[PDB]
Every structure is written in structure tokens, then in C-alpha cells.
Design a binder for this molecule. Sequence first.
Ligand code: BEF
Ligand SMILES: [Ca+2]
Ligand SMILES: [Ca+2]
Ligand SMILES: [Mg+2]
Length: 1021
Amino acid sequence: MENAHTKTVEEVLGHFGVNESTGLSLEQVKKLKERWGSNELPAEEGKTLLELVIEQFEDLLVRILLLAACISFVLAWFEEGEETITAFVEPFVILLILVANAIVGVWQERNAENAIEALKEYEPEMGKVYRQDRKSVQRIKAKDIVPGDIVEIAVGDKVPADIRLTSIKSTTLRVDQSILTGESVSVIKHTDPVPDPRAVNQDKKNMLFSGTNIAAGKAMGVVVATGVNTEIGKIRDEMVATEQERTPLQQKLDEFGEQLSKVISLICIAVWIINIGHFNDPVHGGSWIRGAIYYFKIAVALAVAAIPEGLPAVITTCLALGTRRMAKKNAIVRSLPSVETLGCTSVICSDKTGTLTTNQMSVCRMFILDRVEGDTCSLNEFTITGSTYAPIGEVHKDDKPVNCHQYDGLVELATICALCNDSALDYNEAKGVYEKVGEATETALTCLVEKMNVFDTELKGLSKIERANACNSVIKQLMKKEFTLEFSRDRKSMSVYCTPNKPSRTSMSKMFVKGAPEGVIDRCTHIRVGSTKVPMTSGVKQKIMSVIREWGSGSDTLRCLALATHDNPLRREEMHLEDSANFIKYETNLTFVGCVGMLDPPRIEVASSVKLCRQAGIRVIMITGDNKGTAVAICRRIGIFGQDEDVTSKAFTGREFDELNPSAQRDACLNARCFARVEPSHKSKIVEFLQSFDEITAMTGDGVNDAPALKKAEIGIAMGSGTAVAKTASEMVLADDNFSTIVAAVEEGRAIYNNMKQFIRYLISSNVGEVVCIFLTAALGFPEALIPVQLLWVNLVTDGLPATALGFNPPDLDIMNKPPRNPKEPLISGWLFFRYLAIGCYVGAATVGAAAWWFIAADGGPRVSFYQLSHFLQCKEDNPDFEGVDCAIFESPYPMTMALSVLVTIEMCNALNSLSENQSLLRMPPWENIWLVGSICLSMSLHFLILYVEPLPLIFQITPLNVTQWLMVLKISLPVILMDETLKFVARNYLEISWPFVLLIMPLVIWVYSTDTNFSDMFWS
Ligand code: BEF
Ligand SMILES: [Ca+2]
Ligand SMILES: [Ca+2]
Ligand SMILES: [Mg+2]
């Protein structure tokens, strides 16, 4: 309605019916919802279809092919444009492959993006709020938040809408507003009004902006603007982006592309220089200009054929399929470079609490101090049943020594639990499980205090939703809290000074301490037994410590915390200086040193995933801020640490890690799988130490403690049910909150790299085969077997659709058993270059051999000796060598169509066996890739179309064929697959079976080779 930063707290609350510590009436909530509108920010699309198709065309390889198409169109100008069949087919053939690749890429990328947006709505935006229906804070959808409504926020939470600080419930509130303000450093905030009529966002410390994160604080505010009216919504029209897509893989592939373009240009120059020197034959070649333009067209067609023009398209489709597959498995990938480098990940750091554990925390055990007869102390050691956040589900098993809960010490413990926490429960209509608000520990204590510990009141039959609010409200109303002590890692405890509402019966002064058992057992010097207090005893404290250690002995890995009482505080806030020394000085002596036991179940799908990670060669390290013993126990349970293992030099804490010999420090950073009780700075130091060893690091976490370190790691991962600070600092978000997605991401990255390698291998082999064919034909003096339109058609049929569909390859069988690759090694090894050269040499030799076969030994063709073939140009119709053979036959379109068909079929066969690097088709039948088979069938259908209709063969300078020539084509094209299988076998064994497939291939093979009458060839020179 109006700006509120200048206005004070009183009138902004009085602007609406809103009141502090209470909520808003439902009727006025819906009235303001109807008037102002929902808190939804329009998600406009930033990538239109036109730019989406243009972004594929921008690359050196595609631009060269566009230039070649333009050159072909220019050179085609020998007759008016009305004729669009005789001379207007080669530019169309050049254009068709680019169009097909662009369509495939845009379709795949659009599918991936459409999948991603639906995933972002898997968990609707949630925000804590105060309403009049439920007395305590309740979570509601952030899409429905009216202005002027009380909204509580805590550490590690996104701000649903612009809120003015009505009150602060913590000592200091530090809020990170980097996304809006651009200030990386967190900004301290206060409730003082803004004295600037138009304050800059930097100097506005009175209000919190929507979309911002709180680094460290607890606060409650009033929403002033919602939806687009928020400071993040009005400026949302302005577009912000990084515009960075140069992944290391794409950078090295671009380097490979430019080197390959240089080599292809050199090869084309060689073609020009070697060939035109002897060209003076009178096939419209007695003039230099005509021969020059013809051989220039030949060179342009060879350059078109010999460059991989689907490379950007295949990269784009591989990334799009990876992202879409992660979208299906409920993982939001906000950074394309992440998944591919997840293939190269070598160390996975992780956050024990919240990510590896299931994050739903419940009370399980409780011991009070029974009657003590001296050094030894008898301990009650109760047990509590129920792991879900439900008061109704807890019955205390009715078997413990007390079921009426009449123990005075139990009453005191319940009061401590109720009055020493800042958490609550709420009932959501979505499920039957009551949601957790606040820290897990405090919420578990709150659901602990529900049972009739203090009073045997008959609350049966009351409101279902009132349980979570009235469970501890009775204790709260009879004893008024005064103030609290900040939780500091120096003492690892929290303290609350409370004065009972009781009319001065109990001295009106109490202190309640919630902390670690060690800290309180050291600080406590006065024990509580029954209703009385006894002097400190070494035996009692030692037995309590032994019970705590037993609770930490593999049952639930020591999640217990202690709750203690200080009966005689020195004074009511005599001094409250914000230093750790005073807080410890205020806890000199205490009482009721008994503890309570908690359970944090490790996630089921973690251990197996960990077992996968060590199979892939990826080390897993647990870096957490918890105790060393708890961390080691959780590691052993998960499987990072072997049971009964020497963990002397593999587990560390932050303090001992900091003070080490640099040689010892670097050795420990390599060989340690567990760091415990580490501050965020220490986690970042560990991550950067790991990265300094040329090692790719991936880290996961769901807390602010892990937020800085996630930035240092190469890959950052945040769980869906975690703090939004981790999400903003991470690259991949696990909405489903399932640890199995990480190994799937590593698998997809490795699969993308493998498919890229297969595409490179297939294209390089086929195209060097075509180049070797041209060189062999030129060198041996044989008639030229490839004219520009035929070369362009080969480029269209063997490079466009099958190679693009090669990007849909299913993952390899041994993909998850290989060590992670080093991103610094050369893209193509020496062995791969040899494989490409061998396959290309065979392809070229096979095509030249097919042509020479038609000229020399053919069933429906003339028989011409090899000597005559090598000297075909030397024809004067009267040569004694050339007697009885018409030398116009050397212009026959039959050898040309032989070469065309042989090249096409051999390249399809090469595409068939390019499914895997070193795996035979017997192990990997092509039926797993239906896209590749369909593409091959469609391309062969196109070949049969251009070969067996009336007009099409005329424009391609080819003729229809019969069964015998096709059989010869298949016979000369098959051995490429056998040669590739031999190379794969050699690579498998010396360098490093589907019976149905054999039963299909064998009869077809014997059918092809049933009749053989193609031997007795002449000498090769
Ligand atoms: F144990 Be982690 F730092 F939440
Ligand atoms: Ca090509
Ligand atoms: Ca090719
Ligand atoms: Mg955590």
C-alpha cells in the first residue's frame, strides 16, 4: 500500500488488523488475498523458439558448412533459377543435414527444459506464518501470503516476501542479500526505522527482501509487499545471466574442431595441387577455368564430407538427455557443466547430519537419577516409542517403571524440554504426519513433552490440531520465560533464564541448560536426586558418562543431549556482554545432570550408493560439524569405515587438522575419510586442499555450515528438504531427497563423455575413409568415382541422422567400474588415431576396389585390364593396348553408383558397430538403440528412393541396380564390421554374447557369401 521502512513498528502493524505475536483473521486473509493477489512471481520464458534454433547454428564447423552451401549455390549459377532439379540439389543436400540436426537438437533441448520446469513444482514453496486458526507458527504455501501478515523466519531460510523486522529473537541477525543487492558479504539488520525517504537497498537495514537468505539469525517480520510488488519482482523484468557455457569438455572439443578444420583445409589444398596438375582431358577440361571450377567443387564437397558438422548438435542432445533424465529422477540441475564433470569427480565430500541421515529426529531414551546410596547411582533409563513427529503415536510402551508419569524429576525434565526450546509442531492437511518447525532436536523435545509428564490432565477428545499447541502450553503458561543465552561452540550449550509465574513459591529464579553431556558434566558440580540435591560424586558422573557412551555404542550413534537446572542464578541479567567467556562464567554450578536420548536414522539408500562410489573409483569423505565419535560411528554404519579398522590416521577433527606438519597435513587430507567438528571455514580449507592436488571435488550438504565449502568444490549439491542457503550455493538439488541420484549423475556424465567419444570415432573414421578414397583414386590413375553431388549425398546420409541418433546410446556395461578420467589428458589417444586411420584406409580401399571390380571383373560390364584402367586417359581409339574396348565406358555411371552404394553401406555398418568403444554387438545388440536402427532404415529408404525411381537417378548420375550388384556391395561392405570387432578385441585384451544376434547374423552372412566369383584381381601399384 505504502512504503513502510520509514514508518515505525506501531503504525505498520496498525496499518492492517495484524497484531504482533498473533496472526490474521481468515476472512480478512481471504479479503486481502482477493484484493492484493497471490504471492506468485511470473516465470516468463527467456529462450524463444527462434533463438533456440539459432543457437545451434553458431559454431565454426556449422558456419563452414553454411559457407560451403553458399559457395555451391554461387557456382551452380550456369542457368536460370526456374530449373530447381538439375543444378539446385547440392545446396539443398548441404542444407538438409543442418536442418535435421537443428530439429533434433531443438526438440531434445525443449523436452529437457519442459521437464525441468515441472520438477521445480514438485515441492511447492513453503513459509512459516502466524495465523489465528493455529496459535503457534504454521507452515503454509508461499504462493498464498497476503500482505500485513506475521511471518517468522530462521537461519537458512528463503524470505517468502519483503518483510519489515517487527522484532528479532536472536542476538544478531545476519542476512545474505547477494542476489538482489550484489553484496556478497552478509548484512547485519536491526528494527530501527529507515531515515531515508528513498533508501538504497544497501543502506536498508530495516526490511528483508524477497528471495534473500539469512546467513545466521532468527527473526519475525511483517510482509509489506507480495508477488511482483516485491523488490525482486519489479526488477525481475531486467534480465540477469552468466552467459557462460564453455565447459572444459566443450573447450577441448572446440580445440579439436579447429585443429581438424586446419587439417581438412590442408588436405583440400593437397587435393587441388596434386590433381589439377595433370588435368587437361577434353571432358570440358581443355580450358583452365572449367577444370579449376570443377576441382574446386570437388574440394568443397570433400571438405563438406570430411568435417563433423553434427558435433554441436550431438553435444547439445547429450546434455539435454542428461538433464531430462535427471529431471525424471527428481533432480534439478541448475548448471549444465556440473553433470559432465560429475563423470570426472574423484572425491565426494558429504555432510553427515541432514543429508546422509534422514533428518527426521525423534526421542528414544531417557534416564533420571534414582535414589543414590553413595558412589554408585541407580538409573531409571526409560525408553520412548515412536519415531515420527507425532504426539499421538507415543505411548511410552506402558512397561516402564512409571506409566502415570508421576516422577518429580520427570516433571522437571518435561518443563526443561518445554521451556528450553524455540520449536513447535503443526498439522498439515497434505498428510497425517505433523510437520517439524525449527531445529530437529528442539522439535523432538517438543513432541517428547506432549505426554502427561507434569499433570495428569484429561485432554482426550479435544481438537486434533490443538495437540501440537497445548502439549506444552500448560507448562509455558505456569512459568514465564525471561531471556535466553546464545548457543556458542565454545561451550556447546544453550541457557535460558526463566522466572516462574508461581506466586514466589520457588524463589522466582530458574536457569535451564540444554547442551552436550560432556560440557554439562564438567560444569555441573551438584547432582539432583528425586526431589532433593546431593553433593557432586565422581561415581555418579562416571556412571552417567558410561551410560552416554553405551548409548553411543552403535545403537543410534550418540545423538543424546543433556538438560540441566541451575536453581540459584547470580542475578537477573546483571551483565549480558556478547562474549563466550561470560556465558561459561554464568554456568558455574548446575543440577539435574541427567540426559535424554535421540535417534537419527541413516538414509537407507546411502550405504549402497557409497558402495557404488568406491566401485567407480570415487572416494567418499564425511566432513561434519558433529563429534568425532558420532561421525566415526555413522561412517562405520554407512560403510565408509570398515568395521574393526585402524582409524587412527583416517579420522580427524578441525583443531587437530589445523595443527599438523605440512607433509603430514597433505598426507592426511589424501588418506582421511572423516573430518568432524569443523567450522565452515575449515570445510572450505579441506575442500581447497583436496582441489590443490589436481583432484575434482564434489560436495553435498543442506546447511549454512556447508554453504561456503559448496562454493569451493567443483560440484555443489543440496538436498530438497534442506536449507535454501545450500541450494543457492549448490549446482544440483535433490528434490526427492534421495542419495541414489548422485551415482546416477556420475553415470550420466560418464555416458555423455562415452557417447561423445563414439560420435567422434565414427565421424573421423568414415570421413578419413572418404578422403583416402579420393587420394587412392587420384594416385592410381583410375577414373574419378565421386562427383560433388555424390559426395554431398554421402555426407547427408552417413553424417546427419545416424550420427545424431548415435547420441541416444544406452549406457555402457562397464561404465561404473572405471577410474575417473583426468580432464588434462589429450582428447584422442594414440591408439584411437590408429583405429581411425585403419578404418578409414579400409573404407577408401573398399570403395576403390568396388570401382575397379566393376571395370575389371563384372558380370554385366566390360572386362578391362588394370593397365588400361591406370592409363584410361590415353585413349585415341587406335591404341594397340586399347583394342576392342570403348573408352567412353570410363564415363559409365555404373562404377560411380557402385562407389556410392559401397560407401553408404560401409558407413552404415560402421555406425552399427559404433555403439560401444570396446564392446561387441554380440554383447551389445543394436536393438537397445531403436533410434539408430530407425535412422539407418530411413536413410537406406532414401538411398533406395534415389536409386529406384525415374527422375532421381538422372540428377545423381547413378543408375538402378539388380540383386547381384547389391550382393557384391554387401560382400565388399561387410568386412569393416569384422575388422572393427578385431580392433575392439585387441583393445579389450592386449591394451586393457547374445546368441540370438549370432543366430540372426550367421544365415544372412552365408546368404551374402553364398556365391563368390570375384577373385583373380590384377597387381596393385
Ligand atoms: F554435520 Be553437518 F555440518 F550439518
Ligand atoms: Ca561431414
Ligand atoms: Ca561421412
Ligand atoms: Mg547438515
